[PDB]
Symmetry: D2
Subunit: 361 residues, 4 copies
Amino acid sequence: NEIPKPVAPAPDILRCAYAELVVTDLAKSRNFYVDVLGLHVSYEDENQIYLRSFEEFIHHNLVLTKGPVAALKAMAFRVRTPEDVDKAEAYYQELGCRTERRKDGFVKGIGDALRVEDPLGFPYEFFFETTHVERLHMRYDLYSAGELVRLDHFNQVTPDVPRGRKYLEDLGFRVTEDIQDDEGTTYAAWMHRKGTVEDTALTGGNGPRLHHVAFSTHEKHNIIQICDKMGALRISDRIERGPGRHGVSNAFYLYILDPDNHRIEIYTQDYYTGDPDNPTITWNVHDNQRRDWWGNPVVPSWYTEASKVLDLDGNVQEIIERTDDSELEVTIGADGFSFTRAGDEDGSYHGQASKGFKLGN
Amino acid sequence: EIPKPVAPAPDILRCAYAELVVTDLAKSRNFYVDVLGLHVSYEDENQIYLRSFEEFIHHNLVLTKGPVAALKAMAFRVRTPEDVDKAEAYYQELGCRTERRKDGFVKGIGDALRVEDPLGFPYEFFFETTHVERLHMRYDLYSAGELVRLDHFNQVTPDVPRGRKYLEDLGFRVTEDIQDDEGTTYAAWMHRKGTVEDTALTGGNGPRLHHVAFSTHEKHNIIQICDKMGALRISDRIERGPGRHGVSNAFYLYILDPDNHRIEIYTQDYYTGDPDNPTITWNVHDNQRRDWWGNPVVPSWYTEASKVLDLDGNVQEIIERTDDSELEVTIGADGFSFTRAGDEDGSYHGQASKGFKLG
Amino acid sequence: NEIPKPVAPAPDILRCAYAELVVTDLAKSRNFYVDVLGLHVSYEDENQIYLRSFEEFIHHNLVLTKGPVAALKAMAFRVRTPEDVDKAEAYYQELGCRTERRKDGFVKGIGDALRVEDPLGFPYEFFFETTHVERLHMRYDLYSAGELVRLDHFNQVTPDVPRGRKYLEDLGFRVTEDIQDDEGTTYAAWMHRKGTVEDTALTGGNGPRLHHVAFSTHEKHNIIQICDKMGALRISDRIERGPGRHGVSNAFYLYILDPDNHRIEIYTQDYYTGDPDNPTITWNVHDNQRRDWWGNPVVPSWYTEASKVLDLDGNVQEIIERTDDSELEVTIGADGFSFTRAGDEDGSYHGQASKGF
Amino acid sequence: EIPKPVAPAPDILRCAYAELVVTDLAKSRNFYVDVLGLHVSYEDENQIYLRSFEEFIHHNLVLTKGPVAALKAMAFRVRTPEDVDKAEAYYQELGCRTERRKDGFVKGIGDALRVEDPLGFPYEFFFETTHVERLHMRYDLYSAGELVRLDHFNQVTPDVPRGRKYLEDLGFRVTEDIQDDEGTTYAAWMHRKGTVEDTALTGGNGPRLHHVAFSTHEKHNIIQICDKMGALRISDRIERGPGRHGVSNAFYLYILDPDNHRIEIYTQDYYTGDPDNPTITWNVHDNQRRDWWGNPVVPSWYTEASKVLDLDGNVQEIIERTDDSELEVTIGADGFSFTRAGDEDGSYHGQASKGF
Ligand SMILES: O=C(O)Cc1ccc(O)c(O)c1
Ligand SMILES: O=C(O)Cc1ccc(O)c(O)c1
Ligand SMILES: [Ca+2]
Ligand SMILES: [Cl-]
Ligand SMILES: [Cl-]
Ligand SMILES: [Fe+2]
Ligand SMILES: [Fe+2]
Ligand SMILES: [Fe+2]
Ligand SMILES: [Fe+2]
């Protein structure tokens, strides 16, 4: 059921800014994000770790908060002015959503902040005020071979992609690419404020769940190094998918799994989307170069597994099942189909994945 | 067992070129020149002679039109003219068929010996070759995917220790191999030129040619070949990869030519030229041995390979492997692999890694 | 003399979009930009070549226009809406600047467009409407080892940097980085709309002149390849400066010279500036890591040479002399000084450039 | 000329390590370990032993505390234990001073011969060495600037042809050199291991050690060294580069340690292992021979180099080059260079390139 456009003006959103993830063992999670991935510690204590990327000047891009149930607690967007936090509150109230306003922040290093249970069941935060820290962008004495330089985007699993898409468009996100079929189904969409392919993205599936948080690197070899290091640490089982070239976004990518199975994407070298008539690219769901441009098969966990999300009380949001067709099922499932060249039987796949693989039992 | 000759082994420098029989010369040319960017040393209606960016000998690859795609010769350069005579005496003592041509079998090679070796493979040994313009600083020509050297061959043969011993007598030194705990050898890598490999043995029905490998300068050059193949909408000819190898530590990719000949693109293995270079043995169930990142080995990699010819140009008969199959013991329905030895977490039973089973 | 802030609202400027460069030999220029640099032809004829980068979808990033005097004819910024072109027109009219509007464009592939002689003497164009073309961002069948992927920025030589900076700020550009000394002089400033370090930048010097136009690559090796190719073509003398790591911007860079001596920068991997309180970085002019972070010396030509610019009638703009201190003189001239570590005599340079020259 | 011994030459595999005397061990450690990321094989209060990422022999660099910074030994590994005996006979026949230590001069080397060679350089030959963990897949340790192998040495010596013929007799093959039309040789590069160089000769006053070179995997690893040096505010210790070489075709950088020992970082030269590997001669006036992009060579690169020690640890006396100077004929007041031979456009007279 369609989400109405409020009369109240949308807040002016700059970018994705940070996620707060609940984690079950804080020391194990620190080992992953600090020792394996090289994120920089802005603050920590016995309950939380606050981490930032190489080029960041706001207080953090990631808060790890200890709790009993691993989940997304908030995805936070920075807004352009303090007054945009008021606009966000009015906007979401008009939408009939539950909201919570804290003048001195939910997490350290953030000031006046609004959290909301959005119409798709996701916990969004909007804030302007944040504690500036040392921007480490020229600290090459600290630079790692796998350095994560920026927070890039979030990706959300939600059952009805068009419903979500219209709501985000009204909030001022522009869709850059999407995946559809010839029968009216949308499987995924990507949308931005900051002028890259994405600040958030919708993946069709049971939800609300958080698919991933993405960080970028400077160069492709930096992503290769993360893989290499995970091999040396004998944690290659935590590399879920990749590395690859995306069709959607044209980025070089890797997906890995934190100790609570929160999925992290490492990403580089997408393209500029800031013009308001930026061409929207629609890929057909059966095109086997859409997700991995080289045609490598998409691991089934990538479609089925995602993180729980919390409501404003800290309880897990109940999952609503997708009734639209499943991307997994129509591409690599038993009645699935994919092609390399449209209309060519050669290099097509019927009821199995590419490259000689089938879905595991 | 293959006996060690009394005659001295030829001093082999390196792998030098392969002659591949191809069925459609123009389609093969499109692949090797237009897609992969190899440099033409000579061509006519019957053959295309190709070299890599840094080569100075006449060629690294000869594509010969013929009725049945196959490997016709894998050629090693020897240190001196006299080493061709040494190769001839050596293989005659082994009781192999040999053929000697004072003026070469292909253009740009002089005095050369071809043999049907004890494993059924057509080896060539030569010294003399026509030098060409070494293109190593021709950055006006350099591709985003530039292939810079010929690196190695890889041969499929049923009995790896038997082949390994024979190659050792020939002066190749084993760098890495893959074994299990009950004494089966699945693969071995061996060199002359001070890299991980000049040729390599993969256990399987043979003789078949598994692949020919070319290097690039950097990892991104390999990524570009993938990217270009997607743009050309030939991603279905990317067989496996890209990845980081366990064995060799090289960054890699496997692609298939129009006759299904497999080409590896490879970079950044390590120096093995010291005589006590430490050998590395990997367990066959170690899921990081082939792809260090644990990505699954596609089953065609284990099953498919090119035919090889005898000196008459007929296809060599295949002999079946009786030792255990790497595919079966790792990714088949009774297969298993681990991430950490002894740890059930990150182990895979009856399927491949990353959530796939065999198609 | 301070440029006043209009009552009229500023246009919403998205980004630098294209430059129109007058060149004297269209074929020689084509050889440089297409054959050497690999830019993509959107359109050409006997008078003009329209070129774009690998990831662009608007008609072009660079127009080469044959003419008698090599010069910048227009530096063009795209605005957010058609109504922003009206805003630009009112804004510059209130500034008392000469303006010209053409509903059907000045160059092919651009629709309704306003050109102005701006208060610093530069020919700015603002436009929204443009013909979309095939975006080549996944055409890896065409991708060059030196591929130029985006237009990034322009850099302008102007005698009074503070005066220009205030005007650009009023127009909506935000200063990301600058170079000053301890005596109240500003030598350079960088400023943006699109959320990178720069869409345009001001270099203190006699002006108006165009210092350079900059294009991006994906990776540092792509810039190295441009140098390697120029060596192979035996045109290494057209490499002016670099490659290097910038202090200001933190980008990896290269400066080369086209056949009419128009300077092109190749640039990669600066940082995100889109937050409105993005911290502004000020360097001291004597800091020998401010321009090349590795302390490589800046050749004098980089400071003294720059392209002519045209007025709306196509005539060369008269050059006004800088009276503020010269960055060349104070760092590498006879009485110049630079340091590696502030306050350390070791690694400092008196009356000469770094690294032995 | 240095006569060829009748005794057989030792079979030399490769350059293996250098022993550098340093004046302040902790400062040197900071440079080679904390800045450059070399891996500790052993240390104590007098010495630090260091290796590159892909090495399995005990070390590639030994830093020894001493009163005067100098090269103490440049060591080549030989193929067999018997090659040490061959090296001893060979240098004895040459009339050179030698010292054999059956248990080595430095830790992790066994039976070793040091010699004061005919050019005044302290060479070591050894086979026996303690194997260590080869770190080539320890990506948990890998630095953004990782030094992966020892590549070569470069020696300053007054008479390049004399040194070249000596090295050829020892089995080194020349790959590239720089000459002029009058017949002067200014520099030569020569190898055993099938790369462009294991050692190289630069014309100048000598014996002095010009540099020791380490390789990286990729060009960005070299860029990272420069960026790191910037961040550490020691950019003044970047001497020359980064660049593409003409000779060798390698991507390069030169930096200076705390005692002004020069280290090259190098990647992506070409294969030279075939015995008829084509030799490349550049003209000294060709401005792309050293830096392919035509960037000027700073005078310090031609004039400055490290002292070397004799076997008593005293500094070797230096012999002045009497052949023409490459500095003088290219960038000095009467020098010149060209971009394109015969073209005055892109030529530099009495001046280096690019405006200096
Ligand atoms: O299959 C793997 O990944 C192991 C391996 C290593 C080096 C090679 O050259 C090769 O062809 C295969
Ligand atoms: O000076 C130059 O640039 C030539 C050169 C090539 C290879 C080397 O290893 C070296 O030290 C110097
Ligand atoms: Ca359908
Ligand atoms: Cl995807
Ligand atoms: Cl600069
Ligand atoms: Fe993503
Ligand atoms: Fe291989
Ligand atoms: Fe610039
Ligand atoms: Fe060197």
